Design an enzyme around this catalytic site. Structure first.
Site, PDB file in Angstrom:
ATOM      1  N   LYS A   1      22.708  25.220  69.676  1.00  7.56           N
ATOM      2  CA  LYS A   1      21.535  25.742  70.355  1.00  7.56           C
ATOM      3  C   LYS A   1      21.284  25.116  71.705  1.00  7.56           C
ATOM      4  O   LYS A   1      20.123  24.825  72.017  1.00  7.56           O
ATOM      5  CB  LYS A   1      20.293  25.489  69.519  1.00  7.56           C
ATOM      6  CG  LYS A   1      20.424  25.907  68.077  1.00  7.56           C
ATOM      7  CD  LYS A   1      19.891  27.291  67.806  1.00  7.56           C
ATOM      8  CE  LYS A   1      18.605  27.211  66.988  1.00  7.56           C
ATOM      9  NZ  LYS A   1      18.227  28.519  66.349  1.00  7.56           N
TER      10      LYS A   1
ATOM     11  N   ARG B   1      37.462  32.909  77.112  1.00  4.92           N
ATOM     12  CA  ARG B   1      36.853  32.736  78.415  1.00  4.92           C
ATOM     13  C   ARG B   1      36.467  34.132  78.887  1.00  4.92           C
ATOM     14  O   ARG B   1      37.018  35.138  78.437  1.00  4.92           O
ATOM     15  CB  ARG B   1      37.792  32.094  79.404  1.00  4.92           C
ATOM     16  CG  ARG B   1      38.495  30.824  78.912  1.00  4.92           C
ATOM     17  CD  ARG B   1      38.222  29.589  79.723  1.00  4.92           C
ATOM     18  NE  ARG B   1      38.313  29.791  81.175  1.00  4.92           N
ATOM     19  CZ  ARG B   1      38.837  28.924  82.045  1.00  4.92           C
ATOM     20  NH1 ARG B   1      39.388  27.807  81.646  1.00  4.92           N
ATOM     21  NH2 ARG B   1      38.819  29.179  83.335  1.00  4.92           N
TER      22      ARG B   1
ATOM     23  N   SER C   1      18.166  22.074  74.006  1.00  4.19           N
ATOM     24  CA  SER C   1      16.875  22.719  74.201  1.00  4.19           C
ATOM     25  C   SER C   1      15.677  21.778  73.999  1.00  4.19           C
ATOM     26  O   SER C   1      14.660  21.898  74.695  1.00  4.19           O
ATOM     27  CB  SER C   1      16.753  23.908  73.246  1.00  4.19           C
ATOM     28  OG  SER C   1      17.918  24.697  73.327  1.00  4.19           O
TER      29      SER C   1
HETATM   30 FE   LIG Z   1      34.949  31.997  84.025  1.00  2.44          FE
END
Ligand SMILES: [Fe+3]
Ligand SMILES: *[C@@H]1O[C@H](CO)[C@@H](O[C@@H]2O[C@H](CO)[C@@H](O)[C@H](O)[C@H]2NC(C)=O)[C@H](O)[C@H]1NC(C)=O
Ligand SMILES: *[C@@H]1O[C@H](CO)[C@@H](O[C@@H]2O[C@H](CO)[C@@H](O)[C@H](O)[C@H]2NC(C)=O)[C@H](O)[C@H]1NC(C)=O
Ligand SMILES: [Fe+3]
Length: 691
Positions: free
Chosen positions: A73, A121, A259
């Protein structure tokens, strides 16, 4: 001890080195402290960070996604900036680069050889595989998508793939022994430049990289014209026309952190100082955005030109954008599951009461409508941006916010029009007429007028709503010029305000006495009906609602306890000229005309949403075949749940398809002005995502 030091997590040894140099130059110019930790992969750094053993790491979009999931998170706090100083951008383009000579197109890649930056990616995997999916004949989830890619391309180099399971995906990789197909710089064909080299060497026929790569690795303008781009319209164009020939526009890499206790301020502080002191051409001794000869993109993208701070309200989903965010997710789903989600409408309910009514409607929609929910309207808007929800009906005030975030109006709530009267057959095509915002007071308080309303106690539907806020406060503001909205009145109930503020003083929360000032139906004084009640129970001296509210809640029209005995004659309106009239004379005594509430959604859902709502309202609408007997959409008994109870039908916009056209130039100007005094975090988030 949050700023003591920021702990940067590296993924390789050369990266560790650079991290150390940065550490000393920060200690040679007396800047904020930074310390380095080692790991061997993004995922490890992600874990390192969530386990309080590191503070930050730069990641590609694909891993921004992974880092925001379950255990971890994490959230992005700083984005990389690319382009030039004259035109900076926090986004880049995923392209497919080939050699000048062949004649094949993007739809003819079957059997060819490919080069990818790395598994998972953005530009190297997520985008190209999402785009080629219709050609893969992949049957779905047991079978990994990789497997299907392995049969499509005769050979590829996909760093990080399981070479034991998907040997075809590591074939072209140039690593040595155990470094073959490694997700690291040990594999020479890894990342943007690596994948590009794989093309130059002739190992692969196509390379999936970003728009700047060919320009960063090839100095001679002459060598650049030996390469072209595959466009999604099955044509080929020069590598400089990438704006018009790309597979996707995607968000820039970003620094992530936790967070909870992330030390965002510390992270941001280090970066900014680092950027000022060691950015593009600041000090020869060090280049934050430069990497040693045989190396590339250590810690940050080489040639990036700085960082841009990411607003607090933004989480991983919002950062990625609805398109890309849901595109990732779809890579793990079957075409049937994806098409089914595309066919269904997920409604957002604000509050448990709305969720309850929503569930009932769902169970009767023959699979076309499902529910989701949040405790505020703004939180519901965020779910629609993340694709977890699709639609909801909003007051014009929220239509503004939703618009600035890219959402659009689809249909409007049409109310019993001016006495053209009779249950109109063509309600769905009858142009909307807006409604009347009024100021309501008790008939006995004879001294009360518009000129003396300032200083008294006020009742509002909620902050940022048309009749309850934008219009009243806008009028007052136009006079004084003060941005101090909490001084306009001595005390008020304006749900969505700061609890410890005077704007919350008269609110009474739920039956238990909780949720004071919350912007949903649990606050008994919330909305049209709630603000009226606030007046009738003598909490406030004036209520900012619409004319029909008083009608629908007096003369036994509402047989609830607080309202059972109220009479229409015990109330009056304040006119802008200082006079006062009966509620029945609102056409000559109103503060302004407000735009009808409207249903909003993302651009990609408009058509489907429209056919569903039209169908559903024919069944559960006002003259709905199955309305009294089974269920009525526009009924909830004065609670105005999901829609206004006086909605005749959901009607067409007649061309007013944008929030600007729908709301109107004057009203938009009005809210824009009010917004200079303060903006919501959401509004700040959306300004950032639209740049
Ligand atoms: Fe990239
Ligand atoms: C994906 O599916 C297609 C069709 O479903 C298979 O393609 C064939 O198309 C070529 C070109 O005409 C022919 O060689 C075959 O005869 C076609 N199918 C038939 C009738 O056998 C394609 O081979 C599949 N690609 C995969 C599984 O990777
Ligand atoms: C507050 O509202 C009034 C009403 O429109 C604005 O009105 C005008 O201002 C210009 C410049 O003085 C005058 O030439 C116009 O005649 C005014 N309009 C009207 C209808 O009389 C006023 O500008 C507003 N804004 C503020 C903050 O003063
Ligand atoms: Fe409204």
């Amino acid at each position: 001890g949050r700023r003591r030091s920021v702990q940067w997590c590296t993924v390789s040894n050369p990266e560790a080195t650079k991290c150390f140099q940065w550490q000393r130059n920060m200690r040679r110019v007396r800047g904020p402290p930074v310390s380095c930790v080692k790991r061997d992969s993004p995922t490890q750094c992600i874990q390192a960070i969530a386990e309080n053993r590191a503070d930050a790491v730069t990641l590609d979009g694909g891993f921004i996604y992974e880092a925001g999931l379950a255990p971890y998170k994490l959230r992005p706090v700083a984005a990389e900036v690319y382009g030039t100083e004259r035109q900076p951008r926090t986004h880049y383009y995923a392209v497919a680069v080939v050699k000048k000579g062949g004649s094949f197109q993007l739809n003819e890649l079957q059997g060819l050889k490919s080069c990818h930056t790395g598994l998972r990616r953005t530009a190297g995997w997520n985008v190209p595989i999402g785009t080629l999916r219709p050609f893969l004949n992949w049957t779905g989830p047991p079978e990994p998508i990789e497997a299907a890619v392995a049969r499509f391309f005769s050979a590829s180099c996909v760093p990080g793939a399981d070479k034991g399971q998907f040997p075809n995906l590591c074939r072209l990789c140039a690593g040595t022994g155990e470094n073959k197909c490694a997700f690291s710089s040990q594999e020479p064909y890894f990342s943007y430049s690596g994948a590009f080299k794989c093309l130059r060497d002739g190992a692969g026929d196509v390379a999936f990289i970003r728009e700047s790569t060919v320009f960063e690795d090839l100095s001679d303008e002459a060598e650049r014209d030996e390469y072209e781009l595959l466009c999604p319209d099955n044509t080929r164009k020069p590598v400089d026309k990438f704006k018009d020939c790309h597979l996707a526009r995607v968000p820039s890499h970003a620094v992530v952190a936790r967070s909870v206790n992330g030390k965002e301020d510390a992270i941001w502080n280090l970066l900014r100082q680092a950027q000022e002191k060691f950015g593009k051409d600041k000090s020869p001794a060090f280049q934050l955005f430069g990497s040693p000869s045989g190396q590339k993109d250590l810690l940050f993208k080489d040639s990036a030109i700085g960082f841009s701070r990411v607003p607090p309200r933004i989480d991983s989903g919002l950062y990625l954008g609805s398109g890309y965010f849901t595109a990732i997710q779809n890579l793990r789903k079957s075409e049937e599951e994806v098409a089914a989600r595309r066919a269904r409408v997920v409604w957002c309910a604000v509050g448990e009461q709305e969720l309850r009514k929503c569930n009932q409607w769902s169970g009767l929609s023959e699979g076309s409508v499902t529910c989701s929910s949040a405790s505020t309207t703004e939180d519901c808007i965020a779910l629609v941006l993340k694709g977890e929800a699709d639609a909801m009906s909003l007051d014009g005030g929220y239509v503004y916010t939703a618009g600035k975030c890219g959402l659009v109006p689809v249909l409007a709530e049409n109310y019993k029009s001016q006495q053209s009267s009779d249950p109109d057959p063509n309600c769905v095509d009858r142009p909307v007429e807006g409604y009347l915002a009024v100021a309501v007071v008790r008939r006995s308080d004879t001294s009360l007028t518009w000129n003396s309303v300032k200083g008294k106690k006020s009742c509002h539907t909620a902050v940022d709503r048309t009749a309850g806020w934008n219009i009243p406060m806008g009028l007052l503001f136009n006079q004084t010029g003060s941005c101090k909205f909490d001084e306009y009145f001595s005390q008020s109930c304006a749900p969505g305000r700061d609890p410890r503020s005077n704007l919350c003083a008269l609110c009474i929360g739920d039956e238990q006495g909780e949720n004071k000032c919350v912007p949903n139906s649990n606050e008994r004084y919330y909305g049209y009906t709630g603000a009226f009640r606030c007046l009738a129970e003598n909490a406030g001296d004036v209520a900012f609602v619409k004319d029909v509210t008083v009608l629908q809640n007096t003369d036994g029209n509402n047989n609830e306890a607080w309202a059972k005995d109220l009479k229409l004659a015990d109330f009056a309106l304040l006119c802008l000229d200082g006079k006062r009239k009966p509620v029945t004379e609102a056409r000559s005594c109103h503060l302004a005309m407000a735009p009808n509430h409207a249903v909003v959604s993302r651009m990609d859902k408009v058509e489907r949403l429209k056919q569903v709502l039209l169908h559903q309202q024919a069944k559960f609408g006002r003259n709905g075949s199955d309305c009294p007997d089974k269920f009525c959409l526009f009924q909830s008994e004065t609670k105005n749940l999901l829609f206004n109870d006086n909605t005749e039908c959901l009607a067409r916009l007649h061309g007013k398809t944008t929030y600007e056209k729908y709301l109107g130039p004057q009203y938009v100007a009005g809210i824009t002005n009010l917004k200079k005094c303060s903006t919501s975090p959401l509004l700040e988030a959306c300004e950032f995502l639209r740049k």
